Amino acid sequence: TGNIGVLVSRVTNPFFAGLFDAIERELHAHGYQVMITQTYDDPEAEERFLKQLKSRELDGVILASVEAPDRVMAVAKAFPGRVVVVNADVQIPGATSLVLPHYQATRDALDYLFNQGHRRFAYVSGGTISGAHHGQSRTQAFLDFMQAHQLLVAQDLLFGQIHTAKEGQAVGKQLASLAPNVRPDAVFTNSDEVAVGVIDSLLAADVKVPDDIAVMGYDDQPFAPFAKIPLTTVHQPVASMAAAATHELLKGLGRQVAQDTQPTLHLSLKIRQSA
Amino acid sequence: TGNIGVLVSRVTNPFFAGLFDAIERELHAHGYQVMITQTYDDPEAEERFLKQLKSRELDGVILASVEAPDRVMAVAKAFPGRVVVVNADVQIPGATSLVLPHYQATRDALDYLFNQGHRRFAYVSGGTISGAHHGQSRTQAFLDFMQAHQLLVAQDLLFGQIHTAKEGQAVGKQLASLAPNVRPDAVFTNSDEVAVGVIDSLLAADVKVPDDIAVMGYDDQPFAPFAKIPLTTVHQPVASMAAAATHELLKGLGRQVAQDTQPTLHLSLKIRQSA
Numbered sequence: 001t002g003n004i005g006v007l008v009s010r011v012t013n014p015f016f017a018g019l020f021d022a023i024e025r026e027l028h029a030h031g032y033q034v035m036i037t038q039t040y041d042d043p044e045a046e047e048r049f050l051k052q053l054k055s056r057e058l059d060g061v062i063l064a065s066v067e068a069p070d071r072v073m074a075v076a077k078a079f080p081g082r083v084v085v086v087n088a089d090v091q092i093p094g095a096t097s098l099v100l101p102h103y104q105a106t107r108d109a110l111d112y113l114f115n116q117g118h119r120r121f122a123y124v125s126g127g128t129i130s131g132a133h134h135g136q137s138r139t140q141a142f143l144d145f146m147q148a149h150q151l152l153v154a155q156d157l158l159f160g161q162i163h164t165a166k167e168g169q170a171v172g173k174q175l176a177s178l179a180p181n182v183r184p185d186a187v188f189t190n191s192d193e194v195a196v197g198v199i200d201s202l203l204a205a206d207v208k209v210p211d212d213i214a215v216m217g218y219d220d221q222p223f224a225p226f227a228k229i230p231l232t233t234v235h236q237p238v239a240s241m242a243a244a245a246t247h248e249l250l251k252g253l254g255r256q257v258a259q260d261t262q263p264t265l266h267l268s269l270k271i272r273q274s275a
Numbered sequence: 276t277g278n279i280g281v282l283v284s285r286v287t288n289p290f291f292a293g294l295f296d297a298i299e300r301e302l303h304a305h306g307y308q309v310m311i312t313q314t315y316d317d318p319e320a321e322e323r324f325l326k327q328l329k330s331r332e333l334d335g336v337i338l339a340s341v342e343a344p345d346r347v348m349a350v351a352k353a354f355p356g357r358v359v360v361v362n363a364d365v366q367i368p369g370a371t372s373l374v375l376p377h378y379q380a381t382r383d384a385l386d387y388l389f390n391q392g393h394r395r396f397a398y399v400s401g402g403t404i405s406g407a408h409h410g411q412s413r414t415q416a417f418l419d420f421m422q423a424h425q426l427l428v429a430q431d432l433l434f435g436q437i438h439t440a441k442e443g444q445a446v447g448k449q450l451a452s453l454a455p456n457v458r459p460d461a462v463f464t465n466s467d468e469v470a471v472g473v474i475d476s477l478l479a480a481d482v483k484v485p486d487d488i489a490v491m492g493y494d495d496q497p498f499a500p501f502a503k504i505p506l507t508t509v510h511q512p513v514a515s516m517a518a519a520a521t522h523e524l525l526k527g528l529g530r531q532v533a534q535d536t537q538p539t540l541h542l543s544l545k546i547r548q549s550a
């Protein structure tokens with residue numbers, strides 16, 4: 001029981017820190033040393049990380065983000081059992097790949113918001129909304145939602161490449177500056193980090209949350225229940241997906257026996273105060 | 276420009292995630308691949324990590340926590356230039372070691388609290404307060420403070436091995452349960468994670484923060500200004516200490532030239548709302 005690598009886009013995203021922690025504590029119990037690297041969405045960084053597996057510095061790798069699927073596939077095919085992909089909205093041939101139903105969860109969350117009476121929506125993404133991007137199952141869900149309700153997408157209320165609370169502060173400051181009749185009713189943030197920042201700037205401008213603008217988080221990160229306006233958010237089952245990923249790696253490594261069990265990884269809407 | 280390891284106690288501590296991120300972005304710019312491991316205070320995990328340097332899997336290591344100084348010293352002496360220690364309240368012979376003045380900062384923060392009128396203090400530590408522990412410069416500062424003001428230490432208001440927001444919730448629930456005359460005036464939490472949890476439980480019990488109980492954070496983590504009651508806290512200069520650590524590693528590796536400059540790493544009290 002050797003060295004395992006975990007790859008994520010950004011360790012200061014509490015979702016990824018928490019996912020790492022749950023994987024690492026289990027793998028550690030099994031005798032492995034686990035190390036994490038971050039990519040900042042650079043395919044070169046992914047490729048460099050994978051060279052560690054190719055050179056057998058690592059026994060195995062868990063990727064919780066993927067930049068170049070075809071590159072990951074070639075490595076997985078050369079190293080059967082040693083590459084696991086978790087929650088990256090992709091199935092990589094040659095790697096056991098765990099996908100969660102983010103499209104569904106996003107539709108469900110948007111539906112919740114529509115049902116509270118909201119009609120003018122702002123949509124925030126960590127990707128470039130116009131092109132191919134991470135979190136595009138979610139973007140499609142948003143577009144499908146709007147079409148299903150015959151809601152015109154306001155291009156001025158779309159915000160791409162927004163990741164952090166500080167970036168969310170900038171979004172929220174812009175939204176707070178708007179005249180009530182062009183202000184959104186609700187903001188789908190795609191991230192609890194972003195949501196905390198958005199809400200802070202709204203509140204600083206005496207915009208009421210949720211009465212004036214409802215704010216939907218994503219992930220149910222550790223700080224979410226503790227936020228100034230406790231976050232309504234989409235809960236990701238961090239502990240369960242970590243256990244699943246870990247097991248699929250350990251099985252591939254010949255460590256663990258197959259289980260008949262297969263608990264399903266569920267996203268759930270967590271209603272608090274912000275929406 | 277090869278592989279660098281960073282060692283911390285816990286990646287879900289936002290202080291360590293942020294310190295890692297600042298180190299990693301700089302080292303990445305210099306062509307290195309950086310990976311982080313967590314120890315959970317297990318000396319075995321530290322020793323295993325150091326074997327990576329001993330076997331030349333890694334070019335160098337930055338430790339932001341230290342479990343067994345004498346073990347780290349033996350490695351540093353065998354691998355000159357390749358071990359840097361940052362903000363671990365220890366100078367390790369053979370490793371460039373950066374120490375920040377936590378005793379001073381702690382005294383200063385406690386003094387701030389005394390000056391606001393507080394007299395009955397609760398003290399929380401991530402260590403076992405009675406024995407040798409991480410963060411013991413801070414514990415000594417606390418004891419020295421109390422002695423300097425002839426304040427009797429209440430053993431019932433000392434809380435050890437408290438790290439997370441959930442643990443802080445438990446502390447805060449206990450404190451909120453107390454009759455006003457044995458309730459503390461102020462709580463020194465040693466951690467913004469702990470402080471968020473403490474405050475949440477106080478507020479849940481209609482205890483006023485800071486009017487009934489003032490809560491002092493530590494670190495000035497990303498969420499601190501965004502907390503329900505924005506945290507008064509001790510600010511650690513994460514970006515500056517990361518740059519310093521990185522430079523001392525790169526110098527040791529023969530990458531970088533010596534600088535005459537040497538900006539001093541300052542802790543500062545950040546006053547917000549919670550105290």
Ligand SMILES: OC[C@H]1O[C@@](CO)(O[C@H]2O[C@H](CO)[C@@H](O)[C@H](O)[C@H]2O)[C@@H](O)[C@@H]1O
Binds near residue numbers: 010015064127218
């Ligand atoms: O760090 C945010 C950035 O990471 C990606 C993957 O590269 O998504 C991750 O972060 C989201 C927000 O915390 C999670 O909801 C998602 O499950 C996770 O993979 C990007 O899509 C995002 O912009």
Ligand SMILES: OC[C@H]1O[C@@](CO)(O[C@H]2O[C@H](CO)[C@@H](O)[C@H](O)[C@H]2O)[C@@H](O)[C@@H]1O
Binds near residue numbers: 288290402410
């Ligand atoms: O994770 C908390 C735990 O880490 C230690 C070092 O092992 O201290 C770190 O965390 C503190 C709280 O965030 C920081 O103030 C400190 O600078 C940092 O080294 C323990 O002392 C603490 O219990």
Ligand code: NA
Binds near residue numbers: 185210
């Ligand atoms: Na409204």
Ligand code: NA
Binds near residue numbers: 460485486487488
């Ligand atoms: Na008081």
